[PDB]
Design a protein around this ligand. Structure first.
Ligand SMILES: *[C@@H]1O[C@H](CO)[C@@H](O[C@@H]2O[C@H](CO)[C@@H](O)[C@H](O)[C@H]2NC(C)=O)[C@H](O)[C@H]1NC(C)=O
Ligand SMILES: *[C@@H]1O[C@H](CO)[C@@H](O[C@@H]2O[C@H](CO)[C@@H](O)[C@H](O)[C@H]2NC(C)=O)[C@H](O)[C@H]1NC(C)=O
Ligand SMILES: *[C@@H]1O[C@H](CO)[C@@H](O[C@@H]2O[C@H](CO)[C@@H](O)[C@H](O)[C@H]2NC(C)=O)[C@H](O)[C@H]1NC(C)=O
Ligand SMILES: *[C@@H]1O[C@H](CO)[C@@H](O[C@@H]2O[C@H](CO)[C@@H](O)[C@H](O)[C@H]2NC(C)=O)[C@H](O)[C@H]1NC(C)=O
Ligand SMILES: *[C@@H]1O[C@H](CO)[C@@H](O[C@@H]2O[C@H](CO)[C@@H](O)[C@H](O)[C@H]2NC(C)=O)[C@H](O)[C@H]1NC(C)=O
Ligand SMILES: *[C@@H]1O[C@H](CO)[C@@H](O[C@@H]2O[C@H](CO)[C@@H](O)[C@H](O)[C@H]2NC(C)=O)[C@H](O)[C@H]1NC(C)=O
Ligand SMILES: *[C@@H]1O[C@H](CO)[C@@H](O[C@@H]2O[C@H](CO)[C@@H](O)[C@H](O)[C@H]2NC(C)=O)[C@H](O)[C@H]1NC(C)=O
Ligand SMILES: *[C@@H]1O[C@H](CO)[C@@H](O[C@@H]2O[C@H](CO)[C@@H](O)[C@H](O)[C@H]2NC(C)=O)[C@H](O)[C@H]1NC(C)=O
Ligand SMILES: *[C@@H]1O[C@H](CO)[C@@H](O[C@@H]2O[C@H](CO)[C@@H](O)[C@H](O)[C@H]2NC(C)=O)[C@H](O)[C@H]1NC(C)=O
Ligand code: NAG
Ligand code: NAG
Ligand code: NAG
Lengths: 418, 50, 85, 198
């Protein structure tokens, strides 16, 4: 079939009507970012030649190719540890949550570490770690999974107990329903809206966190970004292994068979063919590993940017920290990766109102100081832009500039004086 | 079939027509001794980086 | 270690910052050469409660350096002269 | 080791050039690594074979050098795009992005030229000498809930004030710095205090 981009949505535009949200959804979304790869090291001499001394004597004629391949792989291996260091080690203080989890109804048990588990992981992090499944050596990562989990636990404790203050200096404690109100004011919604509806926001947040855990437990292709990196590295290593079984035009792919069947003048030619074939295979592997290392470094720089801007602070950048108005984010460790739980504010249950740019009163034009003039049909109010909260149009929330003869669409209404 | 390795006892029960054993990566990791019909695992020697 | 066998370094029970990385959480430093499990940070417990706040009474104007490379050396190689002269 | 990022690039480029020069000393299976020796020792039917071996070895070396030069060029281009972003957002403006222009609340930045690089002096504001206070979300007065317009309610133990969030500056809770929304029955943790009217 011919595909369809999306459902059509004719927005009901007119020159004097506005849509104001009357409700909200606290939406938590997952973002999975790869950070590092498997650190692989190849003994070039043993991969080309094994233990054959005649092969290594012929390999010395080609110079320092093996040194360049080893140095490129060493650079990739230290670049992975540098990537993990830049992503997760953004704090030098290891914070802990208080033993009493009184956060005003907000539940963080699915993201805080479980004391009953020996790995000290969160239930979400435990599910993430469960859902990820010849001269060759695998160097271990410098940071173990326990220490990456400890770093994420410190980041979670800092962003829960101290707000964004720990990312800019000393950790200054603040109650979580106040932190949330500050985040509400960062997206342009008044503190009162948060305080009045704090039970509903806590219930929505807990329901969204549970839906995140259920969606991760019910979707096999949730962690496909990390699995693609793991599969690419394993498939590249398998291809580099399988290139040893090819003779590359020689009589056999085994150096011992050539050295036992032929004299060294012709075994030199056959071994030279095997050497140049295996060297071409190793150069191809190292080149594609360098390209994938550049891609993983770009992804890790992006992940460090999201760690700095979504977890350690509240970001005004649209769609950088989830879909909707970004409130906060929570980091979770993943095998060779990071998972950001973006908690965002989504407006909902919008309602039509008749709107005007200014109010004409006593020959003067009044403009809203922070909100917008709305009308339900008979009476005029001023409300904040992202939530319907009608208030009487007074001189305290409006300002006067000019007369009524200039502004197009100014309407007549009284302005109350306290 | 020649090579270098540590030859240990194997728990892989070969069928009587099979002589060598390969893993996923096509490397000989199991073999049958021709003198006494027993199965031996071939572990690669402990190469390492200094 | 999980990275391998380390000969010539005295393993200590104290945790310091990583000076020379060994791997699997092991780092080495000179003070003789010692090997240790690296500390992640100084441990700080935030005094959280539901009705207390911490307000700064002072400030520090802090200037920090950030070094970023911009360009490389522009190298050109005569391919015919390099291969053949 | 302060300038290690530029010195790393310089050392990598110089080491790549040194390796490319060193690769001329290898014969790649030929009788000699010197072209003049082959051209002065052999007839062209076999000197063609020896020169062909030298040509394919040196061409493989040169293609390898160009491959890592292009990879390092991509890395340096990414770093330079980042540096241009920092020059636009930290020097030519004040950035709200956390840790993009230094540690702390970013105030301004200074560019400095460096050999093949740029050094940003990030001037930032760090809070210090913090003090505990007892806080409340709202003030209950005359059956009405009062919330701070821009600050936060704090208490030193007996008296309630409102202050800006990043610096302790206590002020009397008035109607000029608070706003009224709803009664006192809804907000959890509202406390009783007077609200002064100027
Ligand atoms: C605001 O008013 C407009 C116009 O009265 C509504 O738009 C109509 O919605 C109905 C129901 O979906 C459609 O059948 C019409 O075609 C729409 N008209 C136009 C011109 O788009 C709109 O739904 C109202 N908004 C709300 C939130 O009720
Ligand atoms: C705003 O939306 C929330 C849900 O997003 C509404 O809360 C629901 O209210 C109905 C009826 O009162 C209950 O049956 C549901 O159980 C509530 N859901 C939750 C999650 O609490 C709320 O009523 C809406 N408010 C307005 C003014 O529309
Ligand atoms: C926070 O959330 C957790 C899990 O969402 C709640 O733990 C559940 O508690 C009920 C009753 O106590 C048990 O039946 C469930 O089995 C628990 N779930 C898990 C995963 O342990 C917890 O009660 C919530 N509240 C607090 C204050 O922690
Ligand atoms: C628009 O809003 C105003 C105020 O919210 C409404 O006026 C009130 O309507 C109720 C319903 O009869 C009365 O009991 C109140 O006495 C009215 N208050 C005032 C100050 O007049 C008005 O009815 C709304 N109009 C529409 C079309 O919904
Ligand atoms: C809004 O108020 C202004 C001023 O009270 C109205 O302007 C008057 O309009 C009448 C007839 O249109 C004229 O005779 C007056 O001379 C006008 N006065 C001024 C000062 O301009 C205006 O018509 C009102 N608009 C609406 C929609 O009621
Ligand atoms: C604010 O008060 C809290 C508790 O009253 C202080 O936290 C204590 O600080 C001392 C001194 O370091 C520690 O020995 C205690 O273990 C801390 N208690 C807890 C529960 O963490 C805190 O230091 C005070 N803040 C300031 C700036 O004075
Ligand atoms: C805020 O901190 C500054 C230093 O960061 C304090 O200034 C010092 O004050 C002491 C005593 O008055 C002097 O001996 C120093 O010479 C001052 N240093 C500088 C650089 O001027 C300042 O007093 C602090 N203010 C408050 C209210 O705590
Ligand atoms: C909290 O701050 C207020 C205002 O600075 C203090 O009230 C003053 O305290 C001094 C010293 O006792 C008196 O001389 C003033 O007359 C008080 N002013 C008023 C308006 O009463 C208060 O003492 C402080 N409380 C604590 C516990 O430090
Ligand atoms: C804050 O003030 C309100 C009103 O002055 C207090 O509420 C009254 O409390 C008494 C005793 O608990 C009741 O008999 C009244 O019926 C309450 N009145 C209302 C309007 O609720 C409240 O107790 C005070 N709180 C504090 C902490 O002092
Ligand atoms: C809005 O459009 C209507 C016609 O649809 C027109 O009568 C009215 O003057 C317009 N108002 C403004 C402010 O442009
Ligand atoms: C081969 O010789 C060995 C010598 O010990 C003997 O044990 C075995 O039974 C003989 N036959 C076969 C079929 O292996
Ligand atoms: C804070 O916790 C105490 C118990 O430790 C409780 O009495 C008080 O009501 C709580 N206040 C709020 C606003 O949750």
């Amino acid at each position: 079939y011919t595909m369809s981009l999306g459902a059509e949505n004719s927005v009901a535009y007119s020159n004097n009507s506005i849509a104001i949200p009357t409700n909200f959804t606290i939406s938590v979304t997952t973002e999975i970012l790869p950070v590092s790869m498997t650190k692989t090291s190849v003994d070039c001499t043993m991969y080309i030649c094994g233990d054959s001394t005649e092969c290594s004597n012929l390999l010395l004629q080609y110079g320092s190719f093996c040194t360049q391949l080893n140095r490129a792989l060493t650079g990739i291996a230290v670049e992975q540890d540098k990537n993990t260091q830049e992503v997760f080690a953004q704090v030098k203080q290891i914070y802990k949550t208080p033993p009493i989890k009184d956060f005003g109804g907000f539940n963080f048990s699915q993201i805080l570490p479980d004391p009953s588990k020996p790995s000290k992981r969160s239930p979400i992090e435990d599910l993430l770690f469960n859902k990820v499944t010849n001269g060759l050596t695998v160097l271990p990562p410098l940071l173990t999974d326990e220490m990456i989990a400890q770093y994420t636990s410190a980041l979670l404790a800092g962003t829960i107990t101290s707000g964004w203050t720990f990312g800019a200096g000393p950790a200054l404690q603040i109650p979580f329903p106040m932190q949330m109100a500050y985040r509400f004011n960062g997206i342009g919604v008044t503190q009162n809206v948060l305080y009045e509806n704090q039970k509903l926001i806590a219930n929505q947040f807990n329901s969204a966190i549970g839906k995140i855990q259920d969606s991760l437990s019910s979707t096999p292709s949730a962690l496909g970004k990390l699995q693609d990196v793991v599969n690419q590295n394993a498939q590249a290593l398998n291809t580099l292994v399988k290139q040893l079984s090819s003779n590359f035009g020689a009589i056999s792919s085994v150096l011992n068979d050539i050295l036992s069947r032929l004299d060294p003048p012709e075994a030199e030619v056959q071994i030279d063919r095997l050497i140049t074939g295996r060297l071409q295979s190793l150069q191809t592997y190292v080149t594609q590993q360098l390209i994938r290392a550049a891609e993983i470094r770009a992804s890790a720089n992006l992940a460090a940017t999201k760690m700095s801007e979504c977890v350690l602070g509240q970001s005004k950048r649209v769609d950088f920290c989830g879909k909707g108005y970004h409130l906060m984010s929570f980091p979770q460790s993943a095998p060779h990766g990071v998972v950001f739980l973006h908690v965002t504010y989504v407006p909902a249950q919008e309602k039509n109102f008749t709107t005007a740019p200014a109010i004409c009163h006593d020959g003067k034009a009044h403009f809203p100081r922070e909100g917008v003039f709305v009308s339900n049909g008979t009476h005029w109010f001023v409300t904040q832009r992202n939530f319907y909260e009608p208030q009487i149009i007074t001189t305290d929330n409006t300002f006067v500039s000019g007369n009524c003869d200039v502004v197009i669409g100014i309407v007549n209404n009284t302005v109350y004086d306290p | 079939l020649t090579g270098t390795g540590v030859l240990t006892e194997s728990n892989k029960k070969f069928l009587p027509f099979q002589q060598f054993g390969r893993d996923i990566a096509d490397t000989t990791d199991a073999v049958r001794d021709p003198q006494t019909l027993e199965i031996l695992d071939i572990t690669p020697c402990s190469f390492g980086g200094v | 270690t999980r990275a391998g066998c380390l000969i010539g370094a005295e393993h200590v029970n104290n945790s310091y910052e990583c000076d020379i990385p060994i791997g699997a959480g092991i780092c080495a430093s000179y003070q003789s050469i010692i090997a240790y499990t690296m500390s992640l940070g100084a441990e700080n417990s935030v005094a959280y409660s539901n009705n207390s706040i911490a307000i700064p009474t002072n400030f520090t104007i802090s200037v920090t350096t950030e070094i970023l490379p911009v360009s490389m050396t522009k190298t050109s190689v005569d391919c015919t002269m390099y291969i053949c002269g």
